[PDB]
């Protein structure tokens with residue numbers, strides 16, 4: 001037992017991380033086969049950074065303007081191209097550590113592991129979720145641009161996130177690996193802000209099941225509710241609607257615990273309307289919404305990855 | 307910015323994990339150079355498991371009783387020996403992925419990353435602390451025996467933990483890599499229990515600094531207190547004493563935030579005596595004690611590892 005915000009083993013990604021320097025800017029790149037992926041604002045200098053015309057900036061660049069370091073080994077850039085908000089730097093060396101991978105865009109509410117990096121060098125790994133407002137509450141300092149987020153499914157790394165910027169509330173915004181930003185953010189200096197967020201309702205339910213599986217039952221009740229009546233309480237508490245599909249995805253956990261999903265909704269409703277009254281759940285005094293149904297089944301079962 | 311329970315990149319450890327089978331028992335081993343380290347209760351069967359005489363059990367074993375799988379590659383056991391509560395299985399193959407390592411025993415209060423494993427196959431990574439009662443609040447299922455805990459310091463993996471058992475409250479007990487258990491636990495089936503715990507006071511302070519660095523300041527105050535007066539409040543709230551050395555280790559964070567350590571103690575005291583009154587700190591509604599001063603400086607700075 002136990003329940004921890006658990007990331008995927010990061011080894012397969014660590015051997016893809018490289019350092020991309022261009023001008024005065026150094027950031028992290030993702031080296032897969034003979035291409036390094038990185039944020040396109042590497043070609044900007046501090047005064048480009050305002051309202052840049054990236055297609056103009058890139059024609060003025062040479063291959064040799066791109067210093068790529070794979071550890072202490074220099075990579076020779078033989079080509080460069082722009083795909084949305086990422087650069088694709090073509091190197092003369094395929095990454096022999098290239099894992100099986102995909103470029104997948106995730107949904108708000110889904111989680112992923114983040115291998116935070118500085119100067120192409122991995123620093124830590126931690127689990128995040130894509131907030132309903134398409135931000136992520138990460139832990140990122142200057143130099144972490146180009147750190148990626150990923151899931152791993154057996155041996156395949158599904159890359160889903162490239163880090164690009166911090167927003168003024170301290171949350172983080174970036175792209176999928178195809179260079180398309182998550183949410184209404186841009187790689188310029190504007191007064192952009194996160195925008196209002198919600199709590200991921202299906203994930204709180206999944207985490208309530210995680211609790212029941214792990215022995216916290218004080219919040220259960222005989223009561224039940226309809227899906228409609230639950231959703232009127234969710235809207236009050238800035239929770240995002242629960243759909244029948246969410247109830248369906250919660251079936252396995254309902255099944256394993258013997259707690260009908262709508263019964264669990266009744267419990268959440270009471271938790272939302274009454275607070276916790278000085279008690280905790282899985283060592284938390286808040287309702288946790290960054291574990292998916294997948295994550296709960298993953299730790300409460302024992303699935304691994306080769 | 308941001309603050310996340312952050313583990314070390316796990317790649318260097320993942321390439322040491324192997325599967326040790328012996329009889330009906332399968333668990334994880336740690337392969338470094340030509341030796342696999344694993345818990346000695348692998349040589350037990352379900353009825354040995356009560357009060358075993360492990361030295362008797364091991365003389366009855368043959369080298370060939372030990373199936374060692376490094377992925378899909380079998381390792382030939384050429385020798386076996388017992389060091390306290392671990393087995394040392396000598397294999398004919400040095401692990402070519404052996405990182406620079408040390409075997410270090412940690413102190414209660416210090417943290418480490420845990421690469422949870424099943425059948426020698428890494429499942430997830432997460433950060434833990436050694437509780438004052440020498441347990442750890444991990445996330446471990448059947449088959450996770452032999453998963454290790456570690457820190458990484460530049461390129462060197464300091465291994466500190468081998469997982470051995472779950473205790474009836476769901477917390478976890480194990481050994482250092484020299485086979486010596488953390489705390490008064492034994493690798494038998496007894497009615498052993500965790501024993502009373504405390505909150506790691508120095509770590510809460512470090513995390514309060516993490517908050518101030520990240521913009522949460524609502525809990526600060528003009529007040530101050532003496533170290534003695536603080537420790538009388540700590541004892542009330544089951545916090546463990548703060549020493550001058552703890553204050554000394556907190557200097558850098560005091561220095562960077564401009565908040566004297568004893569001023570921060572005053573804040574903790576008010577937080578202990580008043581609660582949080584519906585507010586949160588670093589997204590937590592509880593006082594967090596599983597970040598050391600090192601961990602805070604590590605994320606709030608940007609140290610990495612090669």
Ligand SMILES: C=Cc1cccnc1
Pocket residue numbers: 140141142143144145164165166307
């Ligand atoms: C302001 C620090 C920062 C954080 C993430 C990305 N870029 C910069």
Ligand SMILES: C=Cc1cccnc1
Pocket residue numbers: 001446447448449450451470471472
């Ligand atoms: C009871 C499950 C378990 C957890 C950790 C280690 N061993 C067994």
